[PDB]
Structures are given as structure tokens and as C-alpha cells.
Amino acid sequence: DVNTLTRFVMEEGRKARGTGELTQLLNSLCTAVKAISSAVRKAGIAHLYGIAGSKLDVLSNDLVMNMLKSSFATCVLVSEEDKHAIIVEPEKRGKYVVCFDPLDGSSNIDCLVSVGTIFGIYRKKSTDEPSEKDALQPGRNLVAAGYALYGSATMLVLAMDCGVNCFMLDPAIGEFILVDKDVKIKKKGKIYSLNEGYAKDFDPAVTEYIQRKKFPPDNSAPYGARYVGSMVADVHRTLVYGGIFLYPANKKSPNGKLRLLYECNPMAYVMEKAGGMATTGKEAVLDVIPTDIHQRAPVILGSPDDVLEFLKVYEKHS
Amino acid sequence: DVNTLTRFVMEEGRKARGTGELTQLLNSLCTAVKAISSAVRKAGIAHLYGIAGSKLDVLSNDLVMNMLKSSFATCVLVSEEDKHAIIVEPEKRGKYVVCFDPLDGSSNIDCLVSVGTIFGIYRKKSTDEPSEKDALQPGRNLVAAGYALYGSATMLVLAMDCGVNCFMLDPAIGEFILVDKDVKIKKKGKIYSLNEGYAKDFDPAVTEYIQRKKFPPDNSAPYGARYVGSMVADVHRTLVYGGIFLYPANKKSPNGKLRLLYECNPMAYVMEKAGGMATTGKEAVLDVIPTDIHQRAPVILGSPDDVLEFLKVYEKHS
Amino acid sequence: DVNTLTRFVMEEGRKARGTGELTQLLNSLCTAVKAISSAVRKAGIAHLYGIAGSKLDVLSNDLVMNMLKSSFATCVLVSEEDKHAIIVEPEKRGKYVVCFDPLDGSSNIDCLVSVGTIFGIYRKKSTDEPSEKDALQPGRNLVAAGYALYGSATMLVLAMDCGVNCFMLDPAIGEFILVDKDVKIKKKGKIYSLNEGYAKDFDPAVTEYIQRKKFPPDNSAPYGARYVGSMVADVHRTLVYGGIFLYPANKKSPNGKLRLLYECNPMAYVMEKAGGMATTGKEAVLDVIPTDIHQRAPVILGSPDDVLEFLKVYEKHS
Amino acid sequence: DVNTLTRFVMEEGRKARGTGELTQLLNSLCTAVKAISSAVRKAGIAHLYGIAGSKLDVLSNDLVMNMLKSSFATCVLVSEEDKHAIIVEPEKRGKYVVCFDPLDGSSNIDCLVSVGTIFGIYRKKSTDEPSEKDALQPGRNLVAAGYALYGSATMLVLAMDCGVNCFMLDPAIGEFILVDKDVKIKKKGKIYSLNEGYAKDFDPAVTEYIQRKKFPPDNSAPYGARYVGSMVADVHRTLVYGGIFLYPANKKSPNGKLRLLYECNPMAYVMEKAGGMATTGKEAVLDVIPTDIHQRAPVILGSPDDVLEFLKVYEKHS
Ligand SMILES: COc1cc(-c2cccc(N)c2)c2oc(NS(=O)(=O)c3cc(Cl)ccc3Cl)nc2c1
Ligand SMILES: COc1cc(-c2cccc(N)c2)c2oc(NS(=O)(=O)c3cc(Cl)ccc3Cl)nc2c1
């Protein structure tokens, strides 16, 4: 028997007997993304091109942002869209907190390459007035999360304590359908993805995890150099065919490029529920403690071996 | 002053004062697409998942077929699905042979990695009954070509005499609007793409060109990798932003991969009309003669320069 | 601000500190309706004309149905499309009997006429192995009922205890947005409606009331005879402007021709919760104690003024 | 086989051997009707009511227009929504003049009732610079015409030389599927149609015809009454179910109510062409000589036999 995303959140919701906030949250959440696909595949582009007579990295926010402030179950909402933090209003408050990237893969969409909404639904901790500090928290506290990847199709994977369930998106009616009941990532990939363009800047470490795949020892067989561009786009695929996403340190900074607050943590939290790791290099992406709500971070994620085989190397040159 | 594909391939019709067999290929084909275009976002997935009780790599094949078997401007069509020649019916005879790669990078859709639809439009020469041969012509005689990119959005590219333009699929009115006029790529891009996993079967003419990007000879910023995996998607970015795609020989068979008539042939064309070159290495693509509708070949195309730098590094090992 | 149907259901649900069976309930209906429209508007229509290579009274039903067993809150269901009462299975069963017309207009849909779906939500009172007996209930024992409409656009009105509320269906994302709050109704209207030709069997009041409008005794602006014939559309109209709707008695049966449990029971519970009136002519509809689930009844309704106006005459002929 | 509105006319175009404005004309229109289609089902109603962070007539009029002129097929454009007439710029000219009622059902599109579009097409008559004088022409003079009704579906009924052919919208891909290959109306109909409140301002004739059916002169089945008000919503329903359409003079005045050029003559051409009858009860609708745009008229239409009855009874009260 079937199950719409907007419903299993009702069931589990009952199943736990809380406030209801989280519910509206998800359903708020959900509808926010259905409203971004519409703009994602260029909605009525017809009008803005002259089919009657007489800007995307924005709607995607101007929507979610609103969907939650207005959701009524929020206090402090972060985002790779505002240098400073947004604080819900006295009337529109709720005991939850949200971090997120409204649309990763952004500018790389001119070439219609796949993008998607990423997010972290952490929980507030004190009676102190909510504030940007509320977000400042370690991945693990995460009370739920997941992301929406609008690519070939419009899949939105959800990631709660009860695991992770794949809810495809029949766009013909306007509702998600559960398609991949409670997941878990394969054991060993046979694909490794990391932009290999800045190899010069790659420490020796990385160097060989790429040179022990291309010219593996056990005279096995060479993984793939696949890597699209957007994280949302790769990560996922990696949790399907299995594999490994590498995005480490170099010239720029030791903390690499990628953001911790919203682009990392979330995912790190999905690999870990599907049974995958997520070491930062010296520890776990989900354990690290936040300084600035835009803090940067390095991340390696993928199957158990494609990171234990990894971590193994990384130390050798340490 | 707004315009839709139909109208486009409508207008050019007049200037030419013809017979109506091109404008009805193009049209009748634009339709089969919007369909695959809705069959990919998992149109009505619900219905087949429980909602009321009780395939692409295929559902798509048809759509072009039947839509072409009934255009009447077709004589004999070939596909990445039906082996020998689909020899059109006496009643639906046309003066053009279509060579199409229905759904590209399809088998990698479970992952929602964008995908496209490739297609080359030629014309019969002989007088003799229509068979595989009538479609054994080289992409230099092509009179029409392009493809559709089923990604974050949907864009199709229509190449022919005059030039190249892209149309956007406003999913709210099933129509394709030309978004850019007579587009051309850049001279020397900053991107390279190819499965860098078979680096260990690679042939030198290429093992230099690679070390020739990550570690350029004049301390100038290194380019950037990226290789979505499903061609159509990859090639496209290579267009919009410019750069170089490569899918060379190795040890699979210097036949390499990518299909001639309906994968390489058309892609070279477009490229070649937007100011680029698409070479096999030992000669430009749109020359290489066709023996069997299923002949492969290795192709490197895009921003002319890279293609050139490349074409160069080649000989240094010949 | 901004509201949907699915989150308004949630906000009431919250404020009511309920059990969680209703909110889930109405969420399983909403869904089925949403999946219906796509069919009414001939979704996979051309696919039928083999564009790729190749009965609604039911499907709808089948939907509201199934999705309704699956809402985990039902024990007995009844429709204009299922002879005997349909008893839910042990597991799934839930404290809410529901009745409904899977789609009123079905027949003359060949004119592509405005149609819909009705639904009477009764809470089971007695206590035994769920059987129609409970389905055997009058309109006033209800806690929810109403409808959704198929016409120019898609609207799903929902009236309970709190009030009427209309939710439009955005074809871009698939969700119902609140279009007009606590929908009330004109004390009077200038629009009466009914099957004008059956004046052959018009019991005095009727034929009279008729000529009480066509030619008003007080020289008033003669009413409009807008008869659509297909409940939904008809009814709904009245709510937006006002007037009077009737499907009277005669040689047909001293009891209309519209079943009572799911075609007058709900609709009544709406005309009433909006500020209007409903009647059988002798008595008030909702106050009828239903015998055979498929019993009928004459139904008069619309703005008060007009009803009681008629009603009066009903006595001048008693 | 299959058929799309576009490929129904592109086929017709070939044989025809004409210019191509017509094809471009219709096509451009076809698209114009799709453009509105979405709009009708309140395509973005989610954005206008808040979901982001913050009247239909003119839009539907704006449309058709900016594309008709932009179809390089027009010249003199008449419309129910522009005082006089609009004269295509000198540069975007054509030969065919077009009369269309952008959207009918506008002062009744609150209750959401079925509203559609009707249109006629005359080929320029004067070598004189495009003015209304030009558009002034008899309905017979019509080169083409037809309509599309936004009902349970967005169907299209196109009237041409051939006959009349229908098209139902598949809002998933976006096309007009040929559904009922060329139609004709019944010989006998059993459903009369009209606003019977204007019963006080009816002339004895029109009056008595309602009488012979309200109560047969030969007690065989007593005709059924229907009437949505909306011009298209009915004539159509008439064409599928046999019946008769009346809207003669009354209190307004002995001339009519419905505009000739676009709310009659087209529907007139349609009725006849398919295979029925048309009259003003003063002479064949179309044949009427124009004396100005908004020129109303008395209109009886539908099935021969019934359009025919009315007549013997019309030359009676005379
Ligand atoms: C009908 O849908 C309902 C009913 C109840 C609920 C709770 C207590 C008593 C009663 N009668 C109902 C819910 O509680 C919650 N709590 S929640 O924080 O939103 C939540 C949502 C989910 Cl995805 C998973 C766990 C939790 Cl913790 N959701 C509900 C949804
Ligand atoms: C397939 O697309 C085509 C091909 C030809 C066309 C005309 C002459 C010779 C050849 N080879 C083709 C057309 O001519 C026309 N002429 S037209 O004025 O628009 C037209 C449209 C229609 Cl609805 C019916 C009759 C006529 Cl008259 N449309 C064409 C569309």
C-alpha cells in the first residue's frame, strides 16, 4: 500500500504524540519545495519572455524563508542567503530551528545541471531569547533533516531519526509518494567523486586515495571520476550506487570551500542513518562545534569502506 | 518579440518555400519530446504505486518512433534500441532518415542524473528502395540535428544551415521558446570532461593533455573537472560555458564508446555550427564514414581552442 | 497572510487537541481529489490515442475509496458507486464513517461539464462490528462534509463546525490555497435553478413558485433560470451569489432523485453552515432519519429569504 | 493512428498549397488558447495570494492579441474588449483579419462555471488600408472559425472547410489531441437551452415552443431543460447531445443580445458546418449584413429538427 510524504509525517507524528509544530514544519517544508520545482524547470517562462506584452537564487529563499516564518513552528532560521541570522517574530514563533541552503548548484544551472534544497531542523535548547547562537550546534543534535534534489526528476529525500525515506514527486497532482522505504547505503562503492581540477592544491593524502583507485593495488578495477558540480546532485547519487564524495583542504583554506551549517551536516546526517560514515578528517562532521553560522568545513562521505579505506590513507601522511 | 519553436521552424519554412517535410519532422518530433519530458519527472508515478490499487529507456523509444513513423517525411529511421534498420512503411514514406539516441545516459536515471535525447536528420540520396544504407550517411550531409536535455529543466537544441538556438520548455503550456539567438561557444574554455577512471588504459596523446590542465606549463590557474556521466548533459555545459569533452579510445576497442550516427555525429554538428570542432583525433567527426548503424568512435569537441591544444598534444605522440 | 488546505486542517487539528484521525482522514481525501482532477482534465489522454503506442465514474470512486481505507481512520464507506456498504478491514479501521459521491456529473461529462465530489463524514456512535447501520445517519450528526469542484479551475470547499472555507488548487505545485474565508451567503438572491422541462409533474407549489418568479407579484427584477444540472456546479454557484436550488417531488417519487446520505446530507450541512437553508418541502433535510443508505429526497436550498419564501407556499398548498 | 491539432493542420496545409499565414495564424492562436488554459485553472494562484512574500479578462485578451499580430498572419483585429478596432502595425502585417471573443463567461466566472473562447477568421476584403470596414463581413464570408471550451477539460472545436474537429488538452505534455474525428449534430435533440426568466419579455412565438415541449403536443418524451448562460458552455454541450439554443429578443430589444462577429457568426459557421441549423428567426445568422462591431442578434441554433420546429411556429405569430 501507498504512502504520500505529507502523510507519513502525520502517522509518525501521531506515533510520537508531540506538539505538532514539527508536522506543520515538514508539510510547510514540503510545499515549499514543490513550489521551487515549478520555478526550477522555468515555470511560465512564457510570460517573462513576451507571451503577453511587457533572479532564481532568490525565490527559492523568498519562499522557504516564508514557508517557515509563516509555518509557525520556528524561532531562528539560518541560510547561505543572509550574512546575518533571521529571528522569527513574537507571534510566528516555535520551538524548532532551521539551517539550510536554498539552492546548491546555483549559477551552474544556466547549463541546467541539477540543483536541490538542503536543510537542517535542529531543536532550540534554552529559555534564553532565541538567537543566531541557537543554530551554533553540532551535527548530531540534529532532530531531523534531509534534502530535495530537482534533477532529471524531482526527488526529495527525507532524513529523520527513524532513518531516511525516498519520496519521489508525481508533479501531475501535486504530491510526493514514498518510493524507497527506509534506506541504507551499499558497502563499497566503485565510483569516487571529487573535482580533480585542483589536484595541485591537494595534500599528498588525497593524492593517493585517488591513485589507489586509478591504479588500485589488488589489481582490481578503477572507480569512476564522475562528479557533476552541485553537491546536492552528487551526494545523493552516491547514496544510490554507493561511492564517495571528497571535498577537502588546500590553498584556499584548511576548511575547504563547503559550508558546515547547511551543506554538510545535513547530508552527513543522511549517510549516517543509511549506515554511512562522514569523517571530516580528524573526526566526524556530525560532532564538530560551530563558531559562525557560515562556518566552513571539509567533508568526505560515502560508504563505510570508501572512507575507512580513505581515513586509512589520510593518516599515513600524518 | 516572443517566439515558440513551432513558429521558428515555421518561419524558416516560408523563406525556403518547400514541401513541408522538414517542418513536420521538427514539429512531429518536438512533440514526442515534451512527452518523454513528462515521462521523466515521473509524470504520474502515484498511479503505479498504490494510490488506486494495482520503463523509460523504452517508453521513450516509442514516442519518437510512432511520432516519426507518422510524420511522413521519414523513409528509414535508426535507433539506439532497434538493432537493424527500422524501415518505414510505404504509406508513411518521407525524404529524411532520422538517426536518434532516444534517452541518453538512461541506465543512470535511478539516480536522477539528467539525460537527453539525441537526433540527426539527414536525407536520402539514391533512388533504390530504403534500407540501412539510406541512413549510412556521414554527419556532414546532415541537414538537421540537435537534442533535448532532460535536466533541472528542459532545453532542446536545433542545429541546421543557419545556426544554433535553444528553446525552453515552459512546463505550464507545453511549448518551447527560443531563449538565445544563434548561440556560439567560447574560443578557449576552462573545463575538461571524460571518465578519468580509465586513466590506466588511456593512450598518451591524452595522458599529456590531462597533466596539461591540472598542471599547466605556464603557472596559470588550472581548469576544472566535471563529468555528469550521461553525455547530453555533459556536452551541453561544454556548450553554454565552453570547454572540452573527451571520450577517447583505450583498451575497450579504439572504437571507444559514444555512438556515431546518433550520439557523436549530431553533437559534433551542433558544436561545429556554434563555432567549434568535434574531432575523432585522427580527423574531424563530420567526415568519418558509416559502415554499420552501430559503429562507435571516440570524440573530443567544444571550445575550438582546447580542441586545438588537444588536437596538438596528439601528434606529439604520433 | 497565506494558507493551504492541508495546513489549515493541521491548525484546527492542533487547536482542538484531538486524537489525530480526522486530520489524517481529510488528508487522504484531499490527495485523492488532487489525483482525480488530472483525470477529469484528461491527463494521460493522448497516451490513449497511442501517441506512444496504444471508465471514470469508477477510477475516481476507486480513488476516494482505496485512499480512504488507507487513511487509517475508517470502518464503513458508502458511495453512489458501490451497492452495499463497504466494510473496512480489521487492521486499518478507524472511528469515522464517511459517505460520498465519487463524482456527481459523471454522465453528461461528454459535454465536458463541471463536476465534483461530495462527502459526508459521520462519526460512528453505537458499538459492534461496523456495518451500514452506522452509515445510516442523518445529516446533523455530522462533523464534516462538503465538496471539491471541477470547473474553470479547481476548488475544494470545506465546511465543518467552524465554517466554510474555499481552497483553490494551483496546477503548478498541487495544493489547495484558501481563496475565501468563513464563506457565508446572501440573505436573498436573484437566481433560481431546476430541471425546467419536468413541469409536467410539478406539484402546485413548484409550478407556482416558478410563476412567482418568472412574473413577480410585486414588480421585482425577475430571477435568472441558470440550470446546469449536475449537483456540484449548480449548488456551489448558489453559495457565491445566492438564489435557490430545487429537485422536487411528483410522480418520480415523493422523494427527489438525489440520494440522501451523500448528495443532500453534505450539501445541506453546507448551505446551513453558510447562513442558508435546506428542506424536503415538508421537513428540513439534514433532520431526516435515513433508512436504506440509497434512499433519496426532494431537496430545496439556497439563500434563506428565497427558501422560506418557497417553503411558505409549500403550506399555502397544505 | 494518432493526431495533434498542429499536425492536423500542418497536414491540411500541404494539400492546400496556399501562403501559410492561416497555419501560422491558427497555430499562434492554438498556443494562445493553451496559454490561457493554464491561466484559467489559476496557474499561479499560489503566488498572487501570498506564498512568496506579497483582472483575468484583459489577460486572456492581452494574450491572443500579442500572438495573433505576432503570427504575422493578421492585420485588422476586432475584439469584444477594445472600443473600436486594433490595426496591426505596418511591419507585423498579414491578410487574414480575425474576430474573436477573448473569453466568454467573464461575468459568471466567480462561481467558476465553464468559460471558453470562440473565434472567426475572414480573409481581408479591401486593397484599402486595414480598418474595421474591412472586418465588417457576413458570417458566411468566414474563412475559418471555431472555439475552445475550458470545461471538465480544455477542449477545442475548430470550424473550417473540411468540417469541425475536436481537441482535448493533455496539460502534462501540452498539445491538442484529435478526439472526435469530424462531427455532426443529431437530427433530433431533447434538450432546449436558454434563460427562461426573460419569459416576461418573450414574444408569443418563442414562448409557445417552450410550451409544446414543457408539455408535448404529442405526449412523447418531455424535453429536458439545461442552460449554463455561458455562450460556449452550451452551444457545445448542444453539439454533443442534440438540442436547441435560444436567446432571442426580449426587454433588451428586438435585435438580439449576443455580438455578431464573434459571439454568433463563428458559432454559426460551426453549427452549420458540423451539420445543423442556424437562424435569427429573421434569416440565416451568418448571412446577416454587418453595420458595426458589437452588433447583437436573435439566435436560435442546434439540431435541425428542433431548430426547424421553431420555424413553422415562427411564421405563425406572423
Ligand atoms: C494527526 O497527526 C498528528 C497527531 C499528533 C498527536 C499528538 C498527541 C496526541 C494526539 N491525539 C495526536 C502529532 O504529534 C506530532 N508531533 S511532531 O513533533 O510533529 C512529530 C512529527 C513526526 Cl513526522 C515525527 C515525530 C514527531 Cl514527535 N505530530 C502529530 C501529527
Ligand atoms: C507542413 O507545413 C505546411 C506546408 C505548406 C505548403 C504549401 C505549399 C507547398 C508545400 N510544399 C507546403 C503550407 O501551406 C499553408 N497555407 S495556409 O494559407 O496557411 C493554409 C492553412 C490551412 Cl490550416 C488551410 C489551408 C491553407 Cl491554404 N500552410 C502550410 C503548412
Ligand SMILES: COc1cc(-c2cccc(N)c2)c2oc(NS(=O)(=O)c3cc(Cl)ccc3Cl)nc2c1
Ligand atoms: C506554414 O508555413 C510554411 C509554408 C511553406 C510554403 C512552401 C511553399 C510555398 C508556399 N506558399 C508556402 C513551407 O514549406 C516548408 N518546407 S519544410 O520542408 O518544412 C522546411 C522547413 C524549414 Cl525549418 C526550413 C526549410 C524547409 Cl524547405 N515549411 C513551410 C511552412
Ligand SMILES: COc1cc(-c2cccc(N)c2)c2oc(NS(=O)(=O)c3cc(Cl)ccc3Cl)nc2c1
Ligand atoms: C499537526 O499535528 C497535529 C497535532 C495534534 C495534537 C493534538 C493534541 C495535542 C498535541 N500536542 C497535538 C492534532 O490533533 C488533531 N485532531 S483531529 O482529530 O485530527 C481534528 C482535525 C480537524 Cl481539521 C478539526 C478537529 C479535530 Cl479534533 N489533529 C492533530 C494534528
